[PDB]
Design a protein around this ligand. Structure first.
Ligand SMILES: [Cl-]
Lengths: 141, 141
């Protein structure tokens, strides 16, 4: 008998432990949650149109301009201009943006190395199978 | 071997998928990442000493007082002396802190119901076996 609060508490303890295997980033920590989330979207799936960021952020066009403006202020992303209409052609990572995303990538490489040292090949099969099955199931509709 | 970015990308896509299953909240989206982390720690596991939050935030006393001062000015938490002790103080949730956590817990339960509706008993057995095995392996040494 295991309520939603109990799963939350377990997930958060786990995250707490990933925090213990995962270093610091000082700009990741200053970012609001939707800024980090949009930053990672562009860093991961490449340059994006405002329209794609607006769709992705399950969010509005207004709140996207705030999020991109704030990421631009921080030096992390830039708008490339369409010279025909003076509107945004894409959001892309800046140099500083790419570097920071390397800190995050690198910290996470070293989290995995630690997790993996705690897994037997058998643990790895079981955990792996359940992760693939969840991704499979959530991709269906 | 495993590349760090490959698994990250697939992890983020999953979260993305969960984003669309999890009702939004105007306070959470405006909080910084470590503010939210400290807020949930107290909301999930009760009132904490500043020491407790530092040790947890794998972080400093200074940076804890800022995260807490910030949570305090959004009206979510307050530092309170112990009635009995009289000489220890802890960060506790305000009334509004509890109302926001209630929304958050409610949204999580909703996402959980949505996820669970996409699993057969067979999908569930594999997924939760994997979950259990990961929690046990990460809790070992
Ligand atoms: Cl799993």
């Amino acid at each position: 008998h295991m309520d939603a609060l109990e799963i939350f508490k377990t997930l958060f303890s786990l995250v707490m432990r990933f925090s213990s295997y995962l270093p610091s980033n000082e700009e990741i920590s200053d970012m609001k949650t939707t800024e980090l989330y949009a930053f990672l979207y562009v860093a991961l799936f490449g340059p994006k149109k405002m329209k794609e960021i607006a769709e992705f952020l399950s969010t509005t066009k207004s709140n996207v301009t705030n999020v991109v403006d704030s990421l631009e202020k921080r030096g992390l992303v830039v708008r490339e201009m369409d010279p025909v209409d003076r509107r945004t052609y894409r959001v892309v990572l800046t140099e500083k943006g790419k570097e920071i995303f390397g800190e995050i990538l690198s910290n996470f490489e070293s989290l995995l190395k630690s997790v993996l040292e705690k897994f037997s090949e058998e643990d790895f099969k079981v955990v792996s199978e359940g992760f693939n099955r969840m991704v499979e199931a959530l991709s269906r509709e």
